Write a protein that binds this ligand. Structure first.
Ligand SMILES: Cc1nc(N)sc1-c1ccnc(Nc2ccc(N(C)C)cc2)n1
Length: 279
């Protein structure tokens, strides 16, 4: 760590503090994250998981029995950009470009059986050229709190969840870019679950076979009727609403994959616009 000079704190999460820092030897500006042998091996395999829509994990430093993750630095997160664009809204062609790129990132990681498990606007990073990238893929499994983007199977206590949890989180982020408001802003596990039920309907064996046998399912859950997406994400067009509905299916087996989402008609006219970034 004597080779790195901290510039400023850019994040604080479950694992640890994230700093913007300068590599004293190369002159490189990086994102430095300060955090078991199985963890060293799993993180070292993530170093080889390279894609245009994944934040590059440059180095894993295991010195003085402490762990540091050195990432490439991007100039802003999606959270700051959504807050900066709250008065006008992010242009729909830019929303579409970012969703398309994040699905490409997900399709790549998922093909390598790597899950994110905690997607949120704070770990989606953007640059001046129009790219968007996912950060912290595979760190949840390797090392073994906002609930707004949590898939219903995680909230109902499924221990062996799938890549579908990331499609759910990304659907929630898509809705939030379009409407400029969090889709399900729960402040407790039960509030999160009941916010999902109040919008999409209380799940049952018809729409989600096996739901009533899930570890934290209670027959005493209130029964709420489902709402129309036209009410949930106005002014999104029918292609966008259809794709969103498939990303938010209750049954993880019915939920669209990232690979299938890339073929959705909503992306017929996708482009790569330039964002207006204030750095
Ligand atoms: C790996 C990682 N984890 C996080 N919590 S931010 C992060 C990361 C990785 C690469 N670039 C960046 N840039 C960045 C720049 C500015 C901010 N302001 C808070 C807007 C945040 C992140 N963060």
């Amino acid at each position: 760590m004597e080779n790195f000079q901290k510039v400023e704190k850019i994040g604080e999460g479950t694992y640890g503090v994230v700093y913007k820092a300068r590599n004293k030897l190369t002159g490189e500006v990086v994102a430095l994250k300060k955090i078991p042998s199985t963890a060293i091996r799993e993180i070292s395999l993530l170093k080889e998981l390279n894609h245009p829509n994944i934040v590059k994990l440059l180095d894993v430093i295991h010195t003085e029995n402490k762990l540091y993750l050195v990432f490439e630095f991007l100039h802003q997160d999606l959270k700051k950009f959504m807050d900066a664009s709250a008065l006008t809204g992010i242009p729909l062609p830019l929303i579409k470009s970012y969703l398309f790129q994040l699905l490409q990132g997900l399709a790549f990681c998922h093909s390598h059986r790597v899950l994110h498990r905690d997607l949120k606007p704070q770990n989606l990073l953007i640059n001046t050229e129009g790219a968007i990238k996912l950060a912290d893929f595979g760190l949840a499994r390797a090392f073994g709190v906002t609930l707004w983007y949590r898939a219903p199977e995680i909230l109902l206590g499924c221990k062996y969840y799938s890549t579908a949890v990331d499609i759910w989180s990304l659907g929630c982020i898509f809705a939030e870019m379009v409407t400029r408001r969090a889709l399900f802003p729960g402040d407790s596990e039960i509030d999160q679950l009941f916010r999902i039920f109040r919008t999409l309907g209380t799940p049952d064996e018809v729409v989600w076979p096996g739901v009533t046998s899930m570890p934290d399912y209670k027959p005493s859950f209130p029964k709420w009727a489902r709402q129309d997406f036209s009410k949930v994400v106005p002014p999104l067009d029918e292609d966008g609403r259809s794709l969103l509905s498939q990303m938010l299916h209750y049954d993880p087996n019915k939920r669209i994959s990232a690979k299938a989402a890339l073929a959705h008609p909503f992306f017929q006219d996708v482009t790569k616009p330039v964002p207006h970034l204030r750095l």
